[PDB]
Amino acid sequence: GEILYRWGLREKRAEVLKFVSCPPDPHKGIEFGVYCSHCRSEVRGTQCAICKGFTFQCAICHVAVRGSSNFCLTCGHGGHTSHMMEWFRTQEVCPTGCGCHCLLESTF
């Protein structure tokens, strides 16, 4: 894997290290929790623990988002990955309407 990575086939190293046995050795650091969509509580996971409902709603589709998701650290809004790619391929402002120019506030 550490030869493949030097070669430049980041996908291939992922396929090879799929088959290692000893855990993934999870990293410890800063974690991104989410304010819940109903009771506004900080829930670390896919579903809230009080209302047991969805915690993140799409700012484009207004539907629950569970898989890949993009967000900016400035305006605190996120949504579906494909949806944000489509929205930001053209525009330079927040489809959440807050005026946060995420294209320059999250490209760090």
Partner 1 sequence: VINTVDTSHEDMIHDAQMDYYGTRLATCSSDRSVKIFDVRNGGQILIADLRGHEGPVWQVAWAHPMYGNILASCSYDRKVIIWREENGTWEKSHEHAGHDSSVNSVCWAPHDYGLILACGSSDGAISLLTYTGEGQWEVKKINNAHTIGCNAVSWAPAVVNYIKRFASGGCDNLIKLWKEEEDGQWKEEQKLEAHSDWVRDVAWAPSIGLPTSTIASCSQDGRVFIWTCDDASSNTWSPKLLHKFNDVVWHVSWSITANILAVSGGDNKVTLWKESVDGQWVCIS
Partner 2 sequence: MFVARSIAADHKDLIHDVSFDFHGRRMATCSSDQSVKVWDKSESGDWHCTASWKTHSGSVWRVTWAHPEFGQVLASCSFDRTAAVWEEIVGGQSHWVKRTTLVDSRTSVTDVKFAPKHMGLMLATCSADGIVRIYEAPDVMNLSQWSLQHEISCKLSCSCISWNPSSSRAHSPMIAVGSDDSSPNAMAKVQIFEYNENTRKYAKAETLMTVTDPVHDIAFAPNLGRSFHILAIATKDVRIFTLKPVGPTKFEIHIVAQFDNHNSQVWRVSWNITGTVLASSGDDGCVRLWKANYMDNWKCTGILKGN
- Which residues contribute to the site for partner 1 (CB under 8 A)? 3, 6-8
Strands 78-80 and 69-71: antiparallel
Q: Does 16 bind Zn ion (CB under 5 A)?
A: no
Alpha-carbon gap, residue 78 to 56, rounded angstroms:
8
Least distance between partner 2 and beta carbon 52 (Å): 4
Least distance between Zn ion and beta carbon 29 (Å): 22
Q: Does 64 bind Zn ion (CB under 5 A)?
A: no
**Whose CA is closest to 59, among 14, 107, 100, 29?**
100
Alpha-carbon gap, residue 39 to 100, rounded angstroms:
25
For partner 2 (CB under 8 A), the number of binding residues is 9
Alpha-carbon gap, residue 75 to 23, rounded angstroms:
35
Binding partner 2 (rule: CB under 8 A), the pick from 44, 47, 86, 91 is 47
Residues near partner 2 (CB under 8 A): 46-47, 51-54, 62-64
